Amino acid sequence: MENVVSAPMPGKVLRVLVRVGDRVRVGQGLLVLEAMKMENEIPSPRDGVVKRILVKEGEAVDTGQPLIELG
Ligand code: NA
């Protein structure tokens, strides 16, 4: 899915760091997944604007699951 940031591993959503409409830059933390016994910031792969937030706190996600859509 183009413009979609997806989960790199299974985990639990701890918090979302951005809001719809936010400008983001490559490497910027978009949300935090608990996995591999740690808290992991999931980065933006590119500069952009946050278009949609596709998960909520507490949600269990799988590898490749859409997390954030960029505009
Ligand atoms: Na799930």
Author numbering: 79 to 149
Sentences from the paper on this structure:
Moderate deviations of up to 2.53 Å were observed at residues 114–116, which constitute a flexible β-turn harbouring the Lys115 residue to be biotinylated.
The wild-type protein produced an orthorhombic crystal form belonging to space group P212121. The structure was determined at a resolution of 1.8 Å, which was intermediate in quality when compared with those of other structures. The wild-type crystal packing is rich in indirect polar interactions mediated by water molecules and a sodium ion, as observed in many other protein crystals. The numbers of nonpolar interactions normalized by the total buried ASA for the three crystal forms were calculated as 0.108 Å−2 for the wild type, 0.099 Å−2 for the A138I mutant and 0.135 Å−2 for the A138Y mutant.
